[PDB]
């Protein structure tokens, strides 16, 4: 399948982030089309679009919007008024490997701004929030400038284009916490609390921000909305599979020549993406890779030609995740990479769980002993059992994400794990440093 | 009229008021599900993950302390489900790895829910040959209460009480990850 | 004392404050009495002790004309101070901690 | 008494000045009112407020915790619980430039570990510590969503892409000695200014932010091979 | 009855009779039930012994006499109905196929929470001829602690009926002389009843004393 620049389309232009450039390419025409439609009509339009969550869950965004309980023509009484609806855009992008949201926001933030306005109109949310991680300050500045431009241009505030719709968009600069990227932890951090996941039910659709109905969407999911409001539904369905239609950003990174963001239809196999990138780092082969971020199970060359869509990744046993596509070649030690990911998870666990907290602590220590040569034959069986005790038992999916690299790496490279038992890591780290 | 829902725990049927938590139903039926963060008088939090049980139709084990009964639910605890027992024992193990070897000197010794539930639902010997987390102990959070953070299982019962029951949230879960620890602000 | 079937041991703990430390760790046995008119020599106490602090020597001669004199306190039960030992009220061995004492890595 | 955490504990507990001067509190109150004005719920402003105080000082202090608690009607305990949870709220005096080498798996094994070791040996400062000059604070950061831009290095959360140990050493030398090299994909400013920006009290219009090579790679390949969208 | 015999109801986790050292664990309710009737295919020779007992006793009499059959830990316990005890005892002793010539004694046990059946008497019977063992269990209420004395059938029950009367107050009516054997005849109360206090004294110590174990805490 070929590359399909849609969001990437405007880039390479001078100052593409400016509202002028965005308008120069049909910018905000989709918003006009939306406001010409009824909110429920917009929700149905997106549902027919088959757009699915780009934040890793893969959930259909249209149904997610439909779950918000608007007063669909029924007014049993004038009081108490229905709780306000909130649209939170998950501009947090902190999953390892995932670097698609940040370039998009930095280059064409008006895509996300228009999508957020359209979505808020769809769910009739009077207020919307862009929760963007604090470690991407350039993206924060770009997004704030874009929101200010939209306010000045009349796309935000009250009576958007005289449509009677009113929306106030707030850019919230979250502090450093990977877990905050998860629903109900995003909301908790928005509420000025510890970014820890909530107990579900109740779900954010009824008990979200400030205990009011809320929708949380990845910036990619929202940004894909304006492209489909124009060009119609059939255009979007023309890309990817029937169960996973549309285009998506793939963040080729790691031991691949010409790494970057490739906008391609869903289902493109890693083989095509590597071919476009020029293949793996010259003089080396593909050892392993993460389709999604570190949260998704590792994959090896055997799956090199599996379509990168939700169905295909599920068939292989992994998850499409955030299309992080982290690539690693022979020079890398799978034990080293998994140890670093486990350290990341231990650093990122909110601590609420016993499984995630304690098990990630233990796994980090075990992997440190493996890499240092203090490992033992029982350490591999431990790693496996501990991961089993973490996976599925933790409170949120971060525990499962922490377990996933360990389980997959063991399954694919028990040989390398055993080899580490001899005297520690045999691989020379300098071999993988891009000759830096 | 209160609505009675009915469900089978293990293989015994029971009727309980709608909205009842699985842990409460098991208590009424006489099944002892291990639990740390659950408290009948506190709003459930599902933190420790100790009360996991297998429920038909659910891929994951469900924290019985957060699961509301349903009119046809089928529940099998560690007494009648190898998966539930394995999950609970793994959680207990992960709970004990960082715990201090303080039972002889711990005040809670002999009356410690962790000791009793490790005996009833824990493995007999450790696999944790690694290094344990450590904190300075015991630090004083008030003139009356000493806090030994190493023994803390981060069940949040102290904090959840000081927030819900008494409106005095002067203690809260500080820090993040393995470093998370109940604490007062600075000196207040 | 917990394991004694005859309630022949009375023990009370106290904190090992830095100014006056008697044992490693944060607790020591401030008051320790054995009522040898209730002791049955079963040996469950020494089986119970998690520190080998309590042993049973082969010495047996014991008798008195007074009931009270056979309630042996900490002073009578403590082993004699041998060569290389210092007075109990002193800080732990340099560069050592409770775990070192229990693992046996302590020397005079 | 000696309540609370011991001062020497890991992840230094919030410490420092106990209270702000009257003028500082007045300016902070103005800024905090401005911040709180933009949220439906007052407590929702806690994270920005924590940034705001972290701009007044170089790091979170009991004075800042108390200010936020008073502003939002929370107890100092709740504010401390929120503050200690997030990594960007540094708990020690932070230099004018927070140099964070991304040492996550990808950026790490692709050079990041080498970059961090080189900076530790060059500055002498260990991760999390600050230079004696007080201008550079070395730290190691998790993935910063710049993976395609390998060995990324953040300077006050401004990107420096495709760094190398020599390049990173030159960057830190420039920061320490004065003239800072421009970020590859951002606009550099002092730590206090970035903290104020995170609170949303800084002008968003800033220079830099060009897409860069990696972000364009896909589009450039599409141009070369003429790949495009299917069109309506 | 047919359900297992609940002898005590313990509330709260950790086997704590009191309110609980830690809040929130006191809501568990677990009845302590001694095993109920065993399904008919009794193991070993128990099945044969019960078949013979039901053959010698009429179906009506067998139903009236045998309240329960419990095969626990490969041991057979016939919960015999009171009043009928002498008849079944005679049948067991005299019948050639049963022939339990050796009654080993009478043991009293008290179940203060077992309504209407607080007092139990256990008759361990052995047949040397067939090399078989069984137990008979006879329940009497605390308010009517009378039981038929087996003195005519098993003279050895004397000094066992007397001992169990002394320690529980079970009145084995028909016994030649049901006088106290262990306690002084002037003694008040029946020591082995659960309500009867242990009667210890505090153990003295320099500056302190340890109350008897019954007064102190326990987690049974
Ligand atoms: C630990 C964890 C971290 C996550 N981080 C992010 C994130 O940074 N950005 C994001 O868009 N989704 C993230 N998610 C997914 C969120 O749950 C997200 O709100 C949900 O998948 C909906 O995304 P959608 O808009 O693609 O449907 C994370 C999930 C977990 C479990
Ligand atoms: S799994 Fe980890 S991140 Fe998720 S709630 Fe539990 S401790 Fe927090
Ligand atoms: S809290 Fe820990 S040290 Fe204290 S008794 Fe319980 S298990 Fe032992
Ligand atoms: S200190 Fe608080 S969180 Fe820790 S175990 Fe006790 S009640 Fe639970
Ligand atoms: S030998 Fe020890 S345990 Fe046994 S009764 Fe005497 S003091 Fe108690
Ligand atoms: S008691 Fe239910 S998860 Fe902790
Ligand atoms: S690994 Fe460095 S930015 Fe992602
Ligand atoms: Zn290695």
């Amino acid at each position: 399948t070929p590359l399909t620049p849609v969001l990437s389309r405007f880039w390479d232009e001078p100052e593409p982030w400016t509202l002028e450039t965005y308008r120069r390419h049909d910018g905000y025409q989709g918003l006009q089309r939306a406001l010409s439609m009824g909110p429920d009509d917009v929700i149905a339009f997106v549902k027919d679009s088959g757009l699915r969550g780009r934040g890793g869950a893969g959930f259909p965004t249209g149904t997610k919007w439909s779950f918000i309980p608007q007063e669909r023509g029924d007014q049993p009484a004038g009081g108490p008024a229905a709780k306000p609806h909130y649209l939170v855009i998950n501009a947090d992008e902190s999953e390892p490997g995932t670097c698609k949201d940040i370039p998009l926001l930095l280059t064409t933030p008006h895509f996300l701004v228009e999508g957020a306005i359209i979505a808020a109109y769809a769910i009739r949310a009077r207020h919307a929030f862009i929760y963007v991680r604090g470690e991407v300050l350039p993206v924060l500045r770009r997004l704030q400038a874009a929101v200010a431009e939209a306010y000045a241009a009349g796309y935000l505030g009250t009576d958007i284009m005289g449509s009677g719709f009113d929306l106030d968009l707030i850019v919230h600069a979250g502090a450093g916490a990977y877990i905050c990227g998860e629903e109900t932890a995003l909301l908790d951090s928005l509420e000025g609390r510890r970014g820890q996941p909530r107990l579900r039910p109740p779900f954010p659709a009824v008990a979200g921000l400030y205990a009011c109905p809320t929708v949380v969407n990845n910036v990619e999911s929202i940004a894909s909305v304006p492209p489909i409001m124009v060009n119609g539904v059939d255009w979007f369905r023309s890309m990817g599979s029937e169960k996973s239609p549309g285009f998506t950003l793939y963040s080729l990174s790691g031991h691949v020549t010409r790494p970057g963001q490739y906008e391609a239809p869903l289902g493109i196999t890693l083989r095509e993406l590597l071919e476009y990138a020029g293949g793996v780092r010259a003089g080396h082969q593909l050892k392993f890779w993460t389709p999604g971020g570190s949260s998704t199970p590792l994959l090896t060359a055997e799956h090199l030609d599996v379509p990168l869509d939700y169905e295909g990744m599920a068939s292989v046993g992994s998850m499409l995740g955030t299309k992080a596509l982290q690539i690693f070649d022979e020079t890398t030690c799978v034990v080293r990479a998994v140890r670093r990911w486990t350290q990341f998870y231990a650093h990122e666990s909110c601590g609420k769980c016993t499984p995630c907290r304690e098990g990630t602590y233990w796994l980090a220590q075990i992997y440190a002993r493996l890499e240092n040569g203090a490992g033992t034959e029982a350490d591999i069986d431990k790693l496996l059992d501990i991961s089993d005790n973490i996976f599925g038992k933790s409170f949120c999916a971060l525990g499962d994400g922490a377990a996933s690299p360990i389980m997959s790496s063991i399954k694919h490279f028990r040989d390398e794990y055993v080899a580490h038992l001899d005297g520690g890591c045999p691989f020379d780290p300098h071999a993988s440093t891009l000759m830096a | 009229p209160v609505e009675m829902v009915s469900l089978t725990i293990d293989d015994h049927e029971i009727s309980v008021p709608k909205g009842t938590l699985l842990i409460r139903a098991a208590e009424l039926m006489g099944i002892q599900i291990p639990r740390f963060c659950d408290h009948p008088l506190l709003d459930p939090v599902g933190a420790c993950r100790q009360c996991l049980v297998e429920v038909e139709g659910q891929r994951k084990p469900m924290a019985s302390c957060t699961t509301t009964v349903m009119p046809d639910m089928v529940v099998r605890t560690q007494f009648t489900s190898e998966a539930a027992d394995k999950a609970q024992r793994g959680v207990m193990e992960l709970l004990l790895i960082n715990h201090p070897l303080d039972c002889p000197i711990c005040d809670k010794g002999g009356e410690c829910p962790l000791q009793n539930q490790a005996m009833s639902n824990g493995r007999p010997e450790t696999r944790f040959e690694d290094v344990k987390r450590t904190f300075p102990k015991p630090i004083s959070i008030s003139s009356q209460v000493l806090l030994d953070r190493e023994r803390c299982v981060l069940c949040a019962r102290c904090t959840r009480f000081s927030s819900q029951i008494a409106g005095d949230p002067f203690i809260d879960l500080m820090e993040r990850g393995a470093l998370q620890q109940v604490g007062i602000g600075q000196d207040k | 004392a917990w394991a004694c079937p005859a309630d022949a041991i009375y023990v009370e703990g106290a904190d090992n404050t830095a100014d006056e430390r008697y044992s490693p760790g944060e607790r020591y046995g401030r008051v320790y009495q054995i009522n040898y008119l209730r002791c049955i020599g079963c040996g469950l106490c020494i089986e119970a002790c998690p520190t080998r602090a309590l042993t049973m020597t082969t010495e047996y001669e014991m008798a008195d004309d007074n009931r009270a004199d056979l309630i042996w306190g900490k002073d009578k039960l403590l082993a004699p101070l041998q060569e290389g030992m210092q007075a109990p009220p002193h800080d732990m061995a340099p560069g050592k901690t409770d775990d070192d004492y229990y693992l046996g890595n302590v020397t005079p | 008494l000696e309540l609370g955490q011991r001062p020497d504990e890991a992840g230094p507990p919030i410490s420092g000045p106990a209270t702000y001067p009257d003028d500082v509190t007045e300016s902070l109150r103005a800024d905090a009112e401005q911040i709180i004005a933009r949220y439906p719920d007052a407590r929702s402003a806690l994270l920005p407020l924590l940034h705001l105080v972290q701009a007044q000082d170089g790091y979170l202090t009991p004075a800042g915790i108390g200010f936020c608690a008073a502003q939002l009607g929370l107890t100092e305990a709740e504010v401390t619980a929120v503050a200690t949870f997030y990594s960007m709220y540094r708990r020690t005096p932070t230099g004018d430039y927070l140099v964070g080498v991304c040492t996550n798996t990808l950026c790490a094994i692709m050079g990041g570990d080498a970059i961090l070791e080189a900076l530790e040996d060059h500055l002498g400062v260990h991760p999390g510590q600050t230079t004696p000059d007080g201008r550079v604070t070395l730290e190691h950061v998790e993935c910063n969503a710049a993976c395609d831009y390998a060995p990324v290095v953040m300077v006050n959360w401004e990107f420096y892409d495709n760094q190398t140990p020599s390049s990173a050493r030159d960057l830190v030398d420039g920061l320490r000695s004065g003239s800072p090299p421009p970020p590859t994909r951002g606009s550099l400013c002092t730590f206090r200014e970035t903290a104020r920006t995170l609170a949303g009290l800084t002008d968003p219009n800033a220079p830099g932010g060009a897409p860069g090579a990696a972000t364009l790679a896909g589009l450039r390949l599409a141009r070369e091979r003429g790949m495009t969208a299917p069109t309506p | 009855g047919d359900e297992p015999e609940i002898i005590a109801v313990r509330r709260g986790m950790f086997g704590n009779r009191d309110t609980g050292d830690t809040s929130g664990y006191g809501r568990l309710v677990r009845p302590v039930a001694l095993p109920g009737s065993t399904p008919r295919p009794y193991g070993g020779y128990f099945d044969a012994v019960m078949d013979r007992l039901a053959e010698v006793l009429g179906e009506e009499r067998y139903a009236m006499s045998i309240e329960r059959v419990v095969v626990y830990r490969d041991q057979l316990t016939i919960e015999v109905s009171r009043v009928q005890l002498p008849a079944v005892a005679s049948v067991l002793r005299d019948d050639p196929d049963l022939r339990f010539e050796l009654c080993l004694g009478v043991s009293g046990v008290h179940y203060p929470e077992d309504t209407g059946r607080e007092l139990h008497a256990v008759y361990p019977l052995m047949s040397i001829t067939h090399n078989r063992r069984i137990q008979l269990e006879v329940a009497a209420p605390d308010a009517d602690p009378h039981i038929p004395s087996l003195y005519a059938v098993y003279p050895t029950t004397d000094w066992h009926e007397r001992e169990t009367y002394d320690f529980f107050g079970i009145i084995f009516d028909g016994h030649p002389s049901l006088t106290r054997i262990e306690m002084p005849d002037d003694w008040e109360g029946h020591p082995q009843r659960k309500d009867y206090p242990l009667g210890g004294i505090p153990v003295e110590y320099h500056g302190a004393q340890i109350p008897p174990p019954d007064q102190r805490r326990s987690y049974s």
Side-chain angles (χ1 to χ4, degrees), chain A residues 335 339 342 359-376 378-380 382-384 386-387 406 410 417 421, chain B residues 94 97 127-128 130-131:
Chain A
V335 184
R339 178 163 101 96
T342 303
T360 55
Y361 185 80
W362 197 5
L363 293 160
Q365 286 212 43
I366 291 163
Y367 269 96
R369 282 170 52 259
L370 287 191
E371 280 282 303
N372 299 348
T376 303
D379 285 307
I380 296 89
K382 278 205 290 185
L383 286 178
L384 273 183
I386 294 158
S387 55
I406 296 162
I410 296 280
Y417 273 91
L421 303 181
Chain B
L94 295 175
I97 59 180
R127 284 151 74 205
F128 187 80
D130 302 332
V131 179

Side-chain angles (χ1 to χ4, degrees), chain A residues 142 190 192 210 261 340 432, chain D residues 43-44 86 103 109 143 148 208:
Chain A
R142 278 282 195 281
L190 266 169
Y210 316 132
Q261 277 68 247
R340 183 47 53 77
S432 65
Chain D
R43 190 186 174 136
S44 191
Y86 302 89
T103 58
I109 69 174
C143 172
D148 51 347

Side-chain angles (χ1 to χ4, degrees), chain A residues 187-200:
Chain A
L187 308 181
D188 278 11
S189 69
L190 266 169
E191 286 177 28
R193 314 178 190 277
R194 296 168 62 75
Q196 302 198 326
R198 297 171 186 187
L199 191 153
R200 296 183 286 268

Side-chain angles (χ1 to χ4, degrees), chain C residues 13-18 21-58 60-74 76-82 84-85 87-90 92-95 97 100-108:
Chain C
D15 302 69
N16 279 306
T17 177
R21 168 175 295 286
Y22 299 81
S23 72
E26 57 184 272
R27 190 189 293 188
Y28 76 102
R30 186 170 209 237
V31 169
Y32 195 104
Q33 306 178 35
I34 299 185
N35 193 323
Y36 277 108
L37 296 184
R38 293 283 183 178
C39 176
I40 56 150
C42 60
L44 273 71
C45 48
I46 54 160
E47 300 183 39
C49 181
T51 63
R52 174 161 263 266
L54 203 72
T55 56
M56 297 188 79
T57 66
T58 49
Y60 51 78
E61 287 183 331
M62 185 180 288
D64 217 332
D65 60 8
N66 175 24
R67 184 194 290 284
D69 282 313
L70 288 168
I71 296 161
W72 275 28
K74 191 183 177 72
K76 299 148 159 286
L77 296 163
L78 271 164
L81 207 67
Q82 309 179 21
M85 282 172 190
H90 71 279
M92 286 194 232
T97 187
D100 294 328
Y101 284 84
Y102 302 123
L103 293 163
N105 309 327
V106 291
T107 55

